[PDB]
Amino acid sequence: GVLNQVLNDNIRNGHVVNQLMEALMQLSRQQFPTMPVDYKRSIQRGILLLSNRLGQLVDLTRLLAYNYETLMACITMNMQHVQTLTTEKLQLTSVTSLC
Amino acid sequence: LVSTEAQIQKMSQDLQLEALTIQSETQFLTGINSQAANDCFKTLIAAMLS
Amino acid sequence: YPSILHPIDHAFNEYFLQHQLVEPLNNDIIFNYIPERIRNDVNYILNMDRNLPSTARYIRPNLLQDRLNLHDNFESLWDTITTSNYILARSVVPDLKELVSTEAQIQKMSQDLQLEALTIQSETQFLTGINSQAANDCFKTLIAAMLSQRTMSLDFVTTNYMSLISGMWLLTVVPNDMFIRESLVACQLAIINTIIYPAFGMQRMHYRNGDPQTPFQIAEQQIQNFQVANWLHFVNNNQFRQVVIDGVLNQVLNDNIRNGHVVNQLMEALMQLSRQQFPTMPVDYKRSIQRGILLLSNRLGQLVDLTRLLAYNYETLMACITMNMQHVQTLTTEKLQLTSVTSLCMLIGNATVIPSPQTLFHYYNVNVNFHSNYNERINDAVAIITAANRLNLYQKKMKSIVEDFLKRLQIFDISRVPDDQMYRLRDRLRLLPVEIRRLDIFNLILMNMEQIERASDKIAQGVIIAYRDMQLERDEMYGYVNIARNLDGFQQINLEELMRTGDYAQITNMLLNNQPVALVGALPFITDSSVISLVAKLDATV
Amino acid sequence: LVSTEAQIQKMSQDLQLEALTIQSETQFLTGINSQAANDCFKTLIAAMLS
Amino acid sequence: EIKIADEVKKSNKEESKQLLEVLKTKEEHQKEVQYEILQ
């Protein structure tokens, strides 16, 4: 009887992140043609960092989704989507910490 | 959680910024601590639920 | 010898007897334990003073190469290993002998350069870093790096043109792939701009930073001179030859470097530069350059023999390696001063220096011990992992085991390692098979573990409930007992499933309605020995 | 930027300067400091804008 | 404070002392021109 904003079922199970790390392994393996090398290397290796966090990020995605849906179950009013005026900040340092 | 320091050493030595001549040397590895990760974990879920 | 044993005990003891690791020993096996190359090296002579009997035995190592491929995406640990082997290798390279005196050489250099006091010159800086203790530093750095396969950078200055000149010798007898790209790109670019293109009136250069082609490549296909183009061809296409020898991979030199002939093409090139006016630039620049390269022309023969000596000691120390010497660029580098390269190229003569066989046996035993310990700890870890999987241990986090695998590899610090590397390493370890000893012991446990669990009269293998006035068995170590030994008929409920996901609905429905059932899992029990407790049906009050 | 005295050594050596000769290569080293370069760099753009 | 080995500084040979005097003169000329420029 309540509206619900649900996810894809390729996210709830963490399977899409495999595709992500495939893309990231590819970006690692490439030549950055015009770029310097001391910077290219650091970028490739920072990518490899998350490419090594594969299973842990699968785990994260599944946990995140599970807690979200279990808490969604405990809602009585329709949960609808509108662009709010003011906006919660999110620091990508925090997402880095999490990942 | 993982030892924060164990990721900080590793990220520092894998990125190797001191080798570079840029001006984000200390500023990359900021917010990496705990009390940031749990914040994001709560913030995502709460913002999707709201 | 006679013995008394239970059949399980006999199984284990017999396995210990039959599958024990010893091998007869004799002097032939003492020789053949030494690497081929060193016996085949005429410069070494070997004797002994004993004749070992057939009674003798020896245990063999496990010199099986890396099952885990730490040369792929474990670059921090590989940097650690590579550094460790590098700073070991430094400890065994010989110290040079009967070097030229520093003043005796500096005086020749100064009189060759005609150092005017009043006027300013680029030629004083050539005397920078001509001491000894740098010659040995370079000699000990190059070889240790090529053995450890540790990359190294080039710190230098664009005003000491002698450094740029000695870089030629360096980049000949050491592959470009041995260095890190930006450093030798800068070196090659300096050399091109300040020795080569002005020596043919070419443009200075217009080199893009991240250009895929290094300056010596597009220099090979601009100039018009056979000697210098051949030199550049060798440089750009010099690289280690991989070859598997006596079980171990080896990064072998050209065999045109092992003999000194490259240096002759280098001389051809430097002389075809000395015969060039510099039309673009003044007299003093040309004067500086031509003096700087006369200083190396007059050292030609020393350079030839130096190159031969480096190659010789490199292969000779290579013979005492057990782990495959993969070539991959490391995170961390070793610094290399080209002033030390100048010192080595200038201060050397009439003194061969060979590794003592004691250094060789030490550098062999160290690597052997490390390699055997690597393999044995791998076997330990794989054993416990496979056993936890086959024992269905599902709450066990396989992280402490990797800590015990790394603490025993006594070069890594685990206080600063992550926790995902451990599970990636686990993912590799699961794929590896087990050795034979551990596998066979485990399989002897598997086919007998249940029989051991039958014993230990503290827990029982389940309790039946059947609301019917069944009979007690006539066992003779007991008398009458409420014992069952088949568990057939009445169905069964496992308890770990119920203690994981608490669903007591089934068992509760079956107990309230008094339905027959069996309960399966290790459970304690008391021995009651009273008939009054029997008649009163107390075992159904539990 | 490149250091100033670091550049003056290279300029002296490329312009081989005799201590006892009144030659015009010395005047090449005049006003080479830093913060004259910033002055020019600001002046040019500020003028072409204004 | 010179950037050259011990055994050349203490060398009582003539060429060594001549070298050292030449190098000191080089240094002092460079310092003179730098001091001028800063003036």
Side-chain angles (χ1 to χ4, degrees), chain C residues 102-103 106 110 117-119 121, chain E residues 7-8 19 22 26 29-30:
Chain C
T102 62
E103 65 273 16
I106 288 164
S110 296
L118 296 172
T119 189
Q121 294 179 357
Chain E
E7 63 181 0
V8 178
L19 185 145
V22 171
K26 299 283 278 183
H29 187 191
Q30 190 71 48

Side-chain angles (χ1 to χ4, degrees), chain C residues 397-455:
Chain C
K397 293 177 73 169
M398 303 297 288
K399 184 175 174 183
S400 66
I401 293 158
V402 178
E403 296 178 354
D404 189 74
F405 173 70
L406 271 71
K407 290 175 187 177
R408 295 291 299 151
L409 301 177
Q410 299 175 0
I411 57 169
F412 299 100
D413 192 359
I414 299 92
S415 65
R416 64 180 179 76
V417 72
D419 302 335
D420 62 355
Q421 283 181 349
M422 295 182 184
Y423 289 141
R424 291 179 62 237
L425 198 58
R426 189 273 305 276
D427 297 336
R428 289 189 179 185
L429 290 164
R430 293 184 303 187
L431 302 171
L432 274 64
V434 186
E435 68 180 1
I436 303 304
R437 306 294 304 286
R438 301 170 191 263
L439 184 66
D440 292 335
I441 295 293
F442 186 67
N443 291 316
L444 291 174
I445 290 171
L446 290 176
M447 67 179 291
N448 291 318
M449 61 186 288
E450 69 280 13
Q451 180 176 359
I452 296 163
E453 196 270 329
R454 301 305 195 183

Side-chain angles (χ1 to χ4, degrees), chain C residues 27-270:
Chain C
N27 293 323
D28 293 331
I29 293 166
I30 305 294
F31 286 160
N32 290 320
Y33 183 79
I34 299 167
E36 291 289 330
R37 294 175 177 176
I38 294 160
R39 290 179 282 167
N40 300 121
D41 193 359
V42 300
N43 296 320
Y44 294 96
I45 293 93
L46 307 175
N47 58 2
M48 61 179 71
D49 59 355
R50 296 289 180 264
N51 289 315
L52 274 66
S54 293
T55 302
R57 301 291 186 275
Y58 74 103
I59 293 164
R60 185 178 291 176
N62 188 357
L63 297 176
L64 185 61
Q65 293 294 325
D66 193 1
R67 275 82 61 77
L68 295 176
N69 304 116
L70 298 174
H71 63 92
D72 186 72
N73 202 355
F74 277 97
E75 297 184 356
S76 296
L77 302 175
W78 185 249
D79 190 70
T80 298
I81 296 164
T82 300
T83 301
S84 181
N85 284 323
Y86 174 73
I87 195 161
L88 180 62
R90 290 184 66 86
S91 66
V92 295
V93 173
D95 294 330
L96 296 168
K97 298 296 292 188
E98 292 288 330
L99 291 168
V100 174
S101 183
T102 62
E103 65 273 16
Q105 182 59 242
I106 288 164
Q107 68 188 0
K108 183 177 75 176
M109 292 168 73
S110 296
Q111 71 183 1
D112 290 331
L113 296 174
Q114 296 294 323
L115 295 176
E116 296 283 328
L118 296 172
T119 189
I120 303 294
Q121 294 179 357
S122 297
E123 292 289 315
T124 310
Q125 290 177 353
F126 298 179
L127 301 178
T128 300
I130 305 302
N131 61 353
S132 69
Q133 195 177 0
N136 292 314
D137 189 73
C138 179
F139 182 75
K140 188 179 269 81
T141 300
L142 298 175
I143 298 165
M146 292 193 285
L147 290 172
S148 65
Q149 290 291 321
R150 188 167 174 76
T151 59
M152 54 185 175
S153 67
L154 287 71
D155 58 350
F156 66 98
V157 180
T158 59
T159 58
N160 189 357
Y161 299 158
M162 178 55 66
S163 299
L164 300 169
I165 293 161
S166 65
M168 296 182 181
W169 180 80
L170 183 63
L171 296 173
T172 52
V173 303
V174 176
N176 301 121
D177 196 2
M178 196 68 207
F179 301 108
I180 197 164
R181 184 169 176 82
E182 66 274 16
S183 295
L184 82 160
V185 167
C187 184
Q188 290 178 358
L189 180 57
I191 294 164
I192 289 289
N193 284 324
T194 192
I195 297 99
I196 295 163
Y197 282 0
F200 293 103
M202 292 295 292
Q203 297 291 319
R204 180 169 184 261
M205 200 167 186
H206 188 279
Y207 187 72
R208 184 66 57 76
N209 190 357
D211 203 5
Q213 294 184 358
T214 185
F216 285 181
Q217 286 180 357
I218 187 158
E220 189 181 3
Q221 62 187 355
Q222 285 176 355
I223 59 175
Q224 298 294 320
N225 191 8
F226 181 74
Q227 291 83 19
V228 179
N230 190 1
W231 180 64
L232 292 171
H233 184 78
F234 182 78
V235 173
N236 289 318
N237 287 312
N238 189 6
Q239 55 181 359
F240 289 109
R241 189 176 73 200
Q242 292 188 350
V243 58
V244 176
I245 300 165
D246 291 329
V248 292
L249 188 65
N250 295 119
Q251 298 291 321
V252 176
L253 293 169
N254 188 8
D255 198 359
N256 198 7
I257 296 166
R258 295 173 70 195
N259 57 1
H261 287 83
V262 175
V263 176
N264 290 320
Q265 284 88 25
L266 177 61
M267 288 296 107
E268 292 286 329
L270 291 178

Side-chain angles (χ1 to χ4, degrees), chain B residues 1-16:
Chain B
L1 294 173
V2 180
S3 296
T4 64
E5 61 274 17
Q7 298 302 113
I8 296 296
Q9 280 110 21
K10 182 169 184 291
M11 293 176 79
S12 295
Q13 67 186 357
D14 292 331
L15 277 69
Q16 294 182 4

Side-chain angles (χ1 to χ4, degrees), chain A residues 22-50:
Chain A
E22 288 172 356
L24 289 167
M25 284 187 285
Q26 184 60 41
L27 291 173
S28 296
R29 290 179 296 176
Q30 284 176 4
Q31 66 185 356
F32 288 71
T34 306
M35 188 181 284
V37 299
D38 59 356
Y39 190 70
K40 179 169 78 70
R41 286 196 299 266
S42 66
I43 295 162
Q44 290 176 353
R45 292 173 182 173
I47 292 163
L48 287 171
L49 265 64
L50 273 79

